[PDB]
Scaffold this active site. Structure first.
Site, PDB file in Angstrom:
ATOM      1  N   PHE A   1       0.757  -1.268   0.098  1.00  0.00           N
ATOM      2  CA  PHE A   1      -0.045   0.015  -0.135  1.00  0.00           C
ATOM      3  C   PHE A   1       0.846   1.323  -0.015  1.00  0.00           C
ATOM      4  CE2 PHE A   1      -3.268   2.944   1.535  1.00  0.00           C
ATOM      5  CZ  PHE A   1      -4.132   2.667   0.537  1.00  0.00           C
TER       6      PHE A   1
ATOM      7  N   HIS B   1       0.593   7.650   1.855  1.00  0.00           N
ATOM      8  CA  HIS B   1      -0.637   8.518   2.126  1.00  0.00           C
ATOM      9  C   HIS B   1      -0.532   9.075   3.408  1.00  0.00           C
ATOM     10  CE1 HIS B   1      -1.325   4.687   3.988  1.00  0.00           C
ATOM     11  NE2 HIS B   1      -2.231   5.331   4.940  1.00  0.00           N
TER      12      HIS B   1
ATOM     13  N   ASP C   1      -3.503   9.746   6.329  1.00  0.00           N
ATOM     14  CA  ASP C   1      -4.892   9.192   6.885  1.00  0.00           C
ATOM     15  C   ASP C   1      -5.748  10.247   6.597  1.00  0.00           C
ATOM     16  OD1 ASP C   1      -3.458   6.723   7.296  1.00  0.00           O
ATOM     17  OD2 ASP C   1      -3.751   6.830   9.609  1.00  0.00           O
TER      18      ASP C   1
ATOM     19  N   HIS D   1       2.885   7.714   5.504  1.00  0.00           N
ATOM     20  CA  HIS D   1       3.272   6.462   5.781  1.00  0.00           C
ATOM     21  C   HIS D   1       2.947   5.433   4.715  1.00  0.00           C
ATOM     22  CE1 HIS D   1      -0.602   7.037   7.449  1.00  0.00           C
ATOM     23  NE2 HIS D   1      -0.687   5.754   7.365  1.00  0.00           N
TER      24      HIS D   1
HETATM   25  C1  LIG Z   1      -2.148   0.283   7.916  1.00  0.00           C
HETATM   26  C2  LIG Z   1      -3.459   0.021   8.419  1.00  0.00           C
HETATM   27  C3  LIG Z   1      -3.988   1.403   8.977  1.00  0.00           C
HETATM   28  C4  LIG Z   1      -4.194  -0.370   7.081  1.00  0.00           C
HETATM   29  N1  LIG Z   1      -4.435   0.494   6.074  1.00  0.00           N
HETATM   30  C5  LIG Z   1      -5.670   1.158   5.753  1.00  0.00           C
HETATM   31  O1  LIG Z   1      -6.702   0.718   6.426  1.00  0.00           O
HETATM   32  C6  LIG Z   1      -5.868   2.148   4.550  1.00  0.00           C
HETATM   33  C7  LIG Z   1      -4.675   3.384   4.976  1.00  0.00           C
HETATM   34  S1  LIG Z   1      -4.662   4.136   6.347  1.00  0.00           S
HETATM   35  N2  LIG Z   1      -7.113   2.923   5.223  1.00  0.00           N
HETATM   36  C8  LIG Z   1      -8.081   2.964   4.109  1.00  0.00           C
HETATM   37  O2  LIG Z   1      -8.070   2.173   3.007  1.00  0.00           O
HETATM   38  C9  LIG Z   1      -9.227   3.549   4.601  1.00  0.00           C
HETATM   39  C10 LIG Z   1     -10.577   2.910   4.878  1.00  0.00           C
HETATM   40  C11 LIG Z   1     -11.531   3.368   5.145  1.00  0.00           C
HETATM   41  C12 LIG Z   1     -12.990   2.575   5.476  1.00  0.00           C
HETATM   42  N3  LIG Z   1     -13.226   1.736   4.279  1.00  0.00           N
HETATM   43  C13 LIG Z   1     -14.048   3.512   5.814  1.00  0.00           C
HETATM   44  O3  LIG Z   1     -15.323   3.378   5.253  1.00  0.00           O
HETATM   45  O4  LIG Z   1     -14.161   3.997   6.947  1.00  0.00           O
HETATM   46  C14 LIG Z   1      -3.428  -1.555   6.557  1.00  0.00           C
HETATM   47  O5  LIG Z   1      -2.916  -2.113   7.098  1.00  0.00           O
HETATM   48  O6  LIG Z   1      -3.182  -1.390   5.043  1.00  0.00           O
END
Ligand SMILES: CC(C)[C@@H](NC(=O)[C@H](CS)NC(=O)CCC[C@H](N)C(=O)O)C(=O)O
Length: 328
Positions: free
Chosen positions: A208, A211, A213, A267
């Site tokens: 990933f 980005h 957050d 990150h």
């Molecule tokens: C690093 C973690 C936070 C995790 N990453 C993540 O969850 C990534 C980057 S912060 N976050 C997202 O895609 C946002 C999800 C929002 C969720 N669908 C909602 O509707 O509220 C991972 O392990 O990939």
């Protein structure tokens, strides 16, 4: 590659009435927030062993049939009202990660925001109780446990900035919070699909990309497999894993309202071929929550930044992250 300084902060005083101790916790939050932007919350009171065990039982027992039935609209055209909540399918040979997202348990058909069809509000979908006994009860209970931890952390952030302890927390309410839990499975796969590995500019293989957050703060549990890196001016640094603590960082809404005094750290997630769990709780406020921006660097705190409604922030932010870094 160097290792980031990620302090471990005992947050237990934020649950108590010793005001000087809460101030010493706030100072440590402030210091971490102005350094790499990450810290581990320890002595947090949440049973993370049970969290990990019940999540594992879920991920390992759900069937393709159930995944379709729970799928978000990106994977099932029939589920036009499931944008956020539900199952995010893996794609064998192409996409490794899969996850289940759920929102405020208080969003029911009767809830006024659901009746008004307000964007970003949805009713959770759950698997069949007889096939996953106790899972929904566990998951909803976990939501309120991590809500409670997050409330306390918000008191720490408020004191850190010189505000009264309810400055953020007053906007973080059980009846309307847009906070979400995501139960992410990162699988061990042999062979691992090349399409699921991204190569960074600097050569690092990723799951990933970089980005900031979309959150006020992010309250993350992960199993004990090193994966996160944080960007500093001198490059990316590894964040060491700790499967007893919660990893905490600010999202871009905190950066907005503090005029970037507390940055939202950039990150990214390294590719590791290992079976693991990543279980974020994204601390979001309510749809109509607005906090006037301020600048702690200035005596009077004056800021020229526009107030930003949390609902507009979140709607745009979630879509931009999908457009930037892909459908998860
Ligand atoms: C690093 C973690 C936070 C995790 N990453 C993540 O969850 C990534 C980057 S912060 N976050 C997202 O895609 C946002 C999800 C929002 C969720 N669908 C909602 O509707 O509220 C991972 O392990 O990939």
């Amino acid at each position: 590659v160097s290792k980031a300084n990620v302090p471990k902060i005992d947050v237990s005083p934020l649950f108590g009435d010793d005001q000087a101790a809460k101030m010493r916790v706030a100072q440590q939050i402030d210091a971490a927030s102005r350094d790499t932007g990450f810290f581990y919350a320890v002595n947090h009171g949440i049973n993370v062993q049970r969290l990990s065990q019940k999540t594992k039982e879920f991920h390992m027992s759900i069937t393709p049939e159930e995944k379709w039935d729970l799928a978000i609209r990106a994977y099932n055209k029939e589920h036009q009202d499931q944008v956020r909540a539900g199952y995010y399918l893996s794609i064998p040979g192409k996409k490794a990660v899969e996850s289940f997202c759920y929102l405020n348990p208080n969003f029911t058909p009767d809830h006024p925001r659901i009746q008004a069809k307000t964007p970003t509000h949805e009713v959770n979908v759950w698997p069949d109780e007889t096939k996953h006994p106790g899972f929904q009860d566990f998951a909803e209970q976990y939501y309120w446990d991590v809500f409670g931890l997050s409330s306390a952390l918000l008191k720490g952030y408020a004191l850190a900035l010189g505000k009264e302890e309810n400055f953020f927390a007053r906007h973080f309410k059980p009846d309307d919070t847009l906070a979400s839990v995501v139960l992410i499975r990162y699988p061990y796969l042999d062979p691992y699909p090349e399409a699921a590995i991204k190569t960074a500019a600097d050569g690092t293989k990723l799951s990933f990309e970089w980005h900031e957050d979309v959150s006020l703060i992010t309250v993350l549990y992960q199993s004990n497999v090193q994966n996160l890196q944080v960007e500093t001016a001198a490059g990316y640094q590894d964040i060491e894993a700790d499967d007893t603590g919660y990893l905490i960082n600010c999202g871009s809404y905190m950066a907005h309202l503090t005029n970037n005094y507390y940055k939202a750290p950039i990150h990214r997630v390294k590719w590791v071929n290992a079976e693991r769990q990543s279980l974020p709780f994204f601390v979001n406020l309510g749809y109509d929550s607005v906090i006037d921006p301020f600048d702690p660097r200035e005596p009077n705190g004056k800021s020229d930044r526009e107030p930003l409604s949390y609902g507009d922030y979140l709607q745009n932010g979630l879509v931009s992250l999908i457009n930037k870094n892909g459908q998860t």
